[PDB]
Amino acid sequence: ILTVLEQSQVSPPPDTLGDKSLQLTFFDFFWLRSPPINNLFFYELPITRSQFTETVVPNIKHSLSITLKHFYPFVGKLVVYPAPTKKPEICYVEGDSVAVTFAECNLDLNELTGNHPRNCDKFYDLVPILGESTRLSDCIKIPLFSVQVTLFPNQGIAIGITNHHCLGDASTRFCFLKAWTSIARSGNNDESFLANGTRPLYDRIIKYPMLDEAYLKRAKVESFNEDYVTQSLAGPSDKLRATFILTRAVINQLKDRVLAQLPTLEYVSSFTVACAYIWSCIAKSRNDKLQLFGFPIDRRARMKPPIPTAYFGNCVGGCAAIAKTNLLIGKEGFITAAKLIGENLHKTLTDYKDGVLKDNDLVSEGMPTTMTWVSGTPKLRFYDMDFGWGKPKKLETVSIDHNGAISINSCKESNEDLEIGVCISATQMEDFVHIFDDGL
Template sequence: MATIPKPATVLERCRVAPAPPPNGSDAAEHPQTLPLVFSDMVWLHFHPTQRLLFYKFPCSKDHFIEHIVPNFKKPLSQALKHFLPFAGNLIYEIDSGNIPELQYRPGDSVPVTVAESNEASDFDYLSGDRPRDAGEFYAFFPDFPPDKIESGWKKIPLLAVQITLFPDTGICIGFNNNHIVGDASSVVGFIKAWSSICRHGGDEEFSSATHLHPFYDRSVIKDPTGLLNNYWNQMKHVKIESPPLNFPTNKLRATYILQKSDIQNLRNLVQAQKQDLVHLSSFTITTAYVWTCLAKSSAAAGEEVAADETEYFVFAVDARQRINPPAPATYFGNCVVPAFAESTHSELKGKNGFLTAVGLVGDVISKKANNKDEILRGADEWLAKLGGMIGKRLFGVAGSPKFDLYDADFGWGNPNKYESVGIDVDGSMSLCKSREFEGGLEIGLSLPKKKMDAFGDVFCGGLKITEQTS
């Protein structure tokens, strides 16, 4: 494994500001502020969210600089006029104790890095599925500019973007965003708007598609029990955050595929043995299977885990249509709530571990997703519960098949590969639709080599067994 990320040569650093709004509006000419709501505050100290999209698009360096880059920046500017918060900052008055807020001010902009990979052959390696050195992906998305302190106010940037040329091979777009600005629904909505504007050579089509425009009215998120103040009083004194990532990462990144037939075989296995389980979605089946495979592979990976040690599984549930009253589908911000399942190590790695995991995950989803009275149950204890899991056997999910980026076409065709880089830090799996198999799912993992090898053996071996018994 390499000890440092392979370098990419920076060709340009610039900033892109929102374009003037249409119809004579002066919206971008005045400060705009968005208050945080309780579902934002959960993510205040969360690590940045980093995404990479790889596009197979052979072009020369001259064509890249003269045509691709300008036609990348202008649509970004046009997209930002609809999504002003991305160009702004999280701000708070350092000594006041007041709740932070999102603010856009005229002149704010998004930092953009233009780069060239030093080795064109890396494209096929990086955009593959097999295990690859996790550290090699860090040359392809930008770091955030440092926080600023001005007149007693702290300003924290929310988005940075990089476009990298692999000469005569392809292009990679790297996104680095602060989770406080929005969840996957909001961020993916922005990326798709930007790609649509880029593909169509202007924002006329997106501007006319008002049903896709972000909804900014925070008053739709009701907080009758004062969760926002509760969370802020906890967060301003104690940071709940993941440990920093060091290099070398000593991790490999790999993608595993569950085809539609694999998911159905696993579902058949459950239905044959536990007919009372009713919530058997692809998400439930997939996450339960991966959670179980991690537990079953622990011994072969050299881990010493006590039989009664708790295994935690945490995932986010989109609450837009589940809160009362519902929020619009295009509500901009964080409108997800954490859901928790837990078992013991011996239960998950045992003969019926998969059945146990499916039952636990399905039960949580059934309660959270199908009962509006349950969506916020226990919310006053969420932060303490999450904080108590740090450093323990915690497994999570980044992304969702609902928010698919494999159709984010910037004019170079659909992506060849999507990578969620943030899973290097928090031990989550990434999850998205398969780019190759209709009805299939892609699972991204970042693990030490010994653990990755052990997981792969259990994962593939389990699928062979279910295929033979179906």
């Protein structure tokens, strides 16, 4: 158990924000029908219930309230209209609030923050539901952001953050969390953020209305209202969650092996080599027929002209590779995976460089028996998010439980090591652990 201590609603301060809209782009419209993103930050601190109630609860409410006045779309809603013409948008109205749940969990915190296999479903009631939609005559309104702060008495605190992808990408979340934590750490005060921090850029500087309508047309907006359903993760399940570590020394040795065997491969990075290694492990674990492995790309810096990091919203692309499973197994399989990822990524980056804006081919060429998409951003350090109690002990992206996805992040006793999160059935996990460890 899970005991809910308070169900609150948090708004920007009185007499700050008026009614505000944010217009969206094809980059945002792409995510119209996506499931929620669920993220957890575990902190170790010997905190009592009385202390949690006396300072943590007020501090979370206050610091968040203040942050919201600078980050209005976080307290806004996604509004989708049934006329295929009128475009979805983010609307904040005075009176809008963020659902913030405060809870207490009696599980041992040490059993959750470890890297070894733990039940995936132990994490679900640490993350808030996105929240009920509001259905009006002219529209549906969907909440964008919710929070759960859970006390582990005498042990620590988990912060559970749920968001709709339409709100923005990992960079957007990073920018918001930077501000919120700065505001919290300095005593519920935004002066350090306003003086030294990075303010979000709401200028609509991505203007491709033809793509806008094509991605919207593809999102099937006229049926969205009738089709939309809540997508909360709930137990029970036999799936296990584990974190696998690639130390910098292992990564470097893997890079070297790729560069020696394939001296003219046009793209090799710590990232591609990490993906190739995990990809190879997944192939050996599955022993299936045909696999696709892919990952998102922050396109801000690759736009022509480049988009500021502080640009608010989505600016994400993608890259995928497909390969027969037998070609991906073993030491040579790792090499092949690196080749395929490196080649596909190089191609995608060149196509961006030369202007290209877009990107059932699977029915024709072959239906993959496994598909894996990477969540996570090793070069954005979510592991440095400090609300006043110190840096996180553990980060978990819970929403990888939903589909074919793994998470890849930095560690944060090291920005140069990689932590790889996997949630898979109990029977498959035993082999996977052996496959991962043995191959290193």
